[PDB]
Amino acid sequence: TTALVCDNGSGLVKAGFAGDDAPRAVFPSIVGRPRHQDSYVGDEAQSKRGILTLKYPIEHGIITNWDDMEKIWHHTFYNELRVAPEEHPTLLTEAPLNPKANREKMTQIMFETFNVPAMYVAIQAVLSLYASGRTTGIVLDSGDGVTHNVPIYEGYALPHAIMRLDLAGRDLTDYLMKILTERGYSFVTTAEREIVRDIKEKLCYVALDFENEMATAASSSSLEKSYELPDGQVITIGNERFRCPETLFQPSFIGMESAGIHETTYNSIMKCDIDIRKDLYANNVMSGGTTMYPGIADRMQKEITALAPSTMKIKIIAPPERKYSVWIGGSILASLSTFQQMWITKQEYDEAGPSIVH
Ligand SMILES: CCN(C=O)/C=C/[C@@H](C)[C@@H](OC)[C@@H](C)[C@@H](CC[C@H](C)[C@H](C[C@H](OC(=O)CCCN)C(C)C)OC)OC(=O)[C@H]1CCCO1
Numbered sequence: 257t258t259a260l261v262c263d264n265g266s267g268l269v270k271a272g273f274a275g276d277d278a279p280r281a282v283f284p285s286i287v288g289r290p291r292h293q294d295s296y297v298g299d300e301a302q303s304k305r306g307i308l309t310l311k312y313p314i315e316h317g318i319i320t321n322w323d324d325m326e327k328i329w330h331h332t333f334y335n336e337l338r339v340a341p342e343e344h345p346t347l348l349t350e351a352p353l354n355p356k357a358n359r360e361k362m363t364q365i366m367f368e369t370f371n372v373p374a375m376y377v378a379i380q381a382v383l384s385l386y387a388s389g390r391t392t393g394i395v396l397d398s399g400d401g402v403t404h405n406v407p408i409y410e411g412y413a414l415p416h417a418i419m420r421l422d423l424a425g426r427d428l429t430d431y432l433m434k435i436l437t438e439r440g441y442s443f444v445t446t447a448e449r450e451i452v453r454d455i456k457e458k459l460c461y462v463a464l465d466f467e468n469e470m471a472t473a474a475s476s477s478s479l480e481k482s483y484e485l486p487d488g489q490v491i492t493i494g495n496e497r498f499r500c501p502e503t504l505f506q507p508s509f510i511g512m513e514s515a516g517i518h519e520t521t522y523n524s525i526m527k528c529d530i531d532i533r534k535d536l537y538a539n540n541v542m543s544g545g546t547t548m549y550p551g552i553a554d555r556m557q558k559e560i561t562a563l564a565p566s567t568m569k570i571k572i573i574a575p576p577e578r579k580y581s582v583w584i585g586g587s588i589l590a591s592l593s594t595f596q597q598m599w600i601t602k603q604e605y606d607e608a609g610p611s612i613v614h
């Protein structure tokens with residue numbers, strides 16, 4: 257009777273059991289194959305990253321390689337959670353604006369390949385909102401491969417008001433790699449990309465005011481931090497710390513014509529019924545690894561406040577567990593009494609087929 261919750265991200269799989277407070281398994285969403293003259297999945301491929309070429313079956317939150325996605329799900333059930341999938345209801349997650357045909361293929365594979373007894377697919381951002389104890393709010397979900405603004409009213413996303421930025425954590429890593437390369441370091445390989453990811457996570461932050469932070473870094477060493485590389489060389493960064501994530505608010509830093517995440521948040525709220533905007537402004541929930549930066553919630557507060565009506569009460573909620581918010585929300589929902597009627601059963605699939613999932 258124990259359901260499974262699998263939150264499949266562009267970069268990381270978060271998997272576990274409904275009712276747990278954290279995912280049992282968190283591993284890279286990769287399939288690795290030998291570079292030269294048979295497959296490795298997840299942590300397997302990370303170990304052998306040196307000798308493998310890596311594929312990510314999910315791009316910008318959307319499954320694009322179904323052969324390798326099947327390998328991921330098989331690995332999730334059999335090697336990480338160590339379950340027989342035919343014995344467990346399985347809650348899967350999907351990105352906002354996931355194409356309807358993709359949801360159908362997810363459904364077909366769960367029932368026909370893994371013979372699950374029941375399953376469901378929920379939108380990631382909605383689950384994050386639930387995990388914060390809300391059914392109304394606007395979620396900023398930013399992961400490794402995509403960022404979305406998702407306004408939600410009384411339990412349900414408002415699809416017409418969703419906004420999408422094809423920029424998230426991996427882009428920020430790649431930008432810092434570029435900055436550090438121009439300063440004379442060599443960050444090229446897959447393992448080297450991972451070093452820069454770690455630098456980013458450990459030392460980058462979002463400035464409250466970019467211009468004043470730049471002025472400070474130009475006139476003082478007070479913002480410098482150092483990082484010891486694996487070969488023992490020490491790197492010092494100052495304004496690189498906040499120029500990297502500034503890209504979220506200024507996508508032009510990496511050549512992108514898109515609006516920044518503050519403008520997409522505002523534009524999302526402005527797409528919603530005027531009568532519910534007060535509730536959205538007061539319930540901005542941040543979700544995903546790329547919202548983890550120190551300063552990001554305060555900066556969002558400042559930027560939304562500048563855009564919004566004078567008298568508007570604005571609140572940014574940044575849960576400490578938000579690297580895993582989506583998963584936690586799925587764990588709560590899949591263990592909820594009210595949800596047990598909502599599972600798609602094998603018996604319903606066999607009669608209606610994949611279309612059943614809408
Ligand atoms: C998923 C498909 N969907 C859209 O895509 C819509 C699915 C509808 C059919 C409902 O699914 C039955 C949704 C809307 C569910 C979500 C409820 C979430 C999980 C959470 C439940 C509380 O848990 C916390 O608050 C955790 C706090 C952690 N600190 C309860 C346990 C105390 O409430 C936010 O709503 C409800 O059941 C009622 C109940 C209270 C308001 O609505």
Ligand SMILES: Nc1ncnc2c1ncn2[C@@H]1O[C@H](COP(=O)(O)OP(=O)(O)OP(=O)(O)O)[C@@H](O)[C@H]1O
Nearest residue numbers: 265266267268317399400401402425544545546548
């Ligand atoms: N403390 C941190 N500061 C900044 N970034 C972080 C931190 N921790 C994790 N990240 C970043 O978050 C990303 C992974 O987050 P998450 O698991 O939410 O994404 P995902 O679900 O795999 O991707 P997506 O939601 O885009 O499909 C990575 O880019 C990682 O570098």
Ligand SMILES: C/C1=C/C(=O)O[C@@H]2C[C@@H](CC[C@H](C)/C=C\CC1)O[C@@](O)([C@@H]1CSC(=O)N1)C2
Nearest residue numbers: 267268284285286302305400425426429449453
């Ligand atoms: C620790 C960890 C973080 C992460 O988010 O990992 C995911 C998954 C990973 C896959 C290859 C990597 C070598 C394997 C495991 C790292 C998993 O790619 C990422 O690191 C990529 C590359 S750099 C970056 O910022 N995103 C993100």
Ligand SMILES: [Ca+2]
Nearest residue numbers: 265266380399
């Ligand atoms: Ca995600």
